[PDB]
Design a protein around this nucleic acid. Structure first.
Length: 55
DNA sequence: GGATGTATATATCTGACACGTGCCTGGAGACTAGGAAGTAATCCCCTTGGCGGTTAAAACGCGGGGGACAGCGCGTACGTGCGTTTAAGCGGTTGCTAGAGCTGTCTACGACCAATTGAGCGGCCTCGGCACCGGGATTCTCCAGGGCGGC
């Protein structure tokens, strides 16, 4: 009985994809392990910088 | 006749070679899975050598004046030197704490795998808005009749 799946971006209240950023961090040869909050934080920072330049 | 310059020998200092030891990290051997090489098909972009026509950019010439450069004067601000001060540099005290290193335990967090499903990509239908065509309302130019003048 799986629950209703929701995205990690909606959990973090973001528009940038947390899962895509996590996959690019895991396959980008940056470290052996990637923490859970690191793609959330990096997606938030990227979304903020995009918001500043777009405004 | 006395003391000085110089040569050879002996003890000591110092960098380098080899011996010893730990240990831990690289190498040898075996197994396995998947990354990448190779193959075939399809489709679109790039190459080389041409042609035609438009047209705006490039090239050329010439006059002239603005700006780069040289020279000169001048005055000020920086170099130079000396005497004095001062603070850097070294050595030293005295405790406490931060941090590297090592060892040990444990637990939460992230890798991994299977099933699922819902967000991303493409096309299709519809609406908002812009545009094409038909019909009604308003204003401008014109042709003809009436009256007056001349022989």
């Amino acid at each position: 009985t799986r629950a209703k799946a929701k995205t990690r971006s909606s959990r973090a209240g973001l528009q940038f994809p947390v899962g895509r950023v996590h996959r690019l961090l895991r396959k980008g040869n940056y470290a052996e392990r990637v923490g859970a909050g690191a793609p959330v934080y990096l997606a938030a920072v990227l979304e903020y910088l995009t918001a500043e330049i777009l405004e």
